[model samples]
Target: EVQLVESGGGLVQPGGSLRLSCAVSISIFDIYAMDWYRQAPGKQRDLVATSFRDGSTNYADSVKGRFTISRDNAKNTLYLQMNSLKPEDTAVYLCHVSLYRDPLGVAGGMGVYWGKGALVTVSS
Candidate 1:
């Protein structure tokens, strides 16, 4: 089994960026890439961004300008950054590890492991 510990986020101020962190217990992953997902109120879960093992990334069109992904190998932590935060950005964000990859990036679906998620709210 894989363990993912999530942290960071709370009462995010509008116009500022929120940085959500996920710490992996097994040194990130040796055989897979990582993806960030979000579930906003009344909307289906959405894939925000992805980071590949070969040092590459991709983002969904919904978050093309507002979301970004990064990682710290030394701490085994993955990060998701949301800029221009608004009420619409309030959601539960989860971190996941992919099971397989393609020449472009992760081709496996739904991921192999998931984090408990961090609920972030934008306060007025």
Candidate 2:
């Protein structure tokens, strides 16, 4: 089975940026896409971005301005950067991998593996 390990992200001052990393244990060649999300302590999750192994990416309307999602194909690692941080941005960030493509070239609907997630706090 595939697994994603989340790292980095602890505390950042207000107006600064937070960088979170996710390392993948499976071969990149076997994966189709990676999705990123953020969730506040008692709220619903928010979509941040979705990146395909083909190098294409899509950012959610809420994240387009202050967030960036990137990957290191060579290192099999995914990255998330949230700039101009606010206390509201303090939350747990997750990296989810999808191996949704079937042998018939059909794409499945959801993520198959999720990271344990990393907590990020915005403070003074």
> TM-scores of all models?
0.83, 0.85
Model 2: lowest-lDDT 10 consecutive positions: 102-111
Tell me the lDDT of model 2 at 113.
78
Among these predictions, the greatest lDDT belongs to: 2
Local error of candidate 2 at 9, Å? 0.9
Q: Model 1: runs farther than 4 Å from truth? A: 29-31, 102-111
Q: Residues 1-124, candidate 1, lDDT per residue (tens digit)?
A: 5678778877878877888899887776453688888898888998888988888898988778888898788888999888988787788998888756555655445347888899989878
Model 1 lDDT-worst window of ten: 102-111
Residue 85 lDDT (model 2): 86
Instruction: State the displacement of the C-alpha of residue 47, model 2, in Å, after optimal TM-score superposition.
Output: 1.3
Q: Write the per-residue lDDT of candidate 2 for residues 20-74, one digit (tens) a residue.
A: 8899986665577888988999899887898887888999886678988888878
TM-score of 2: 0.85
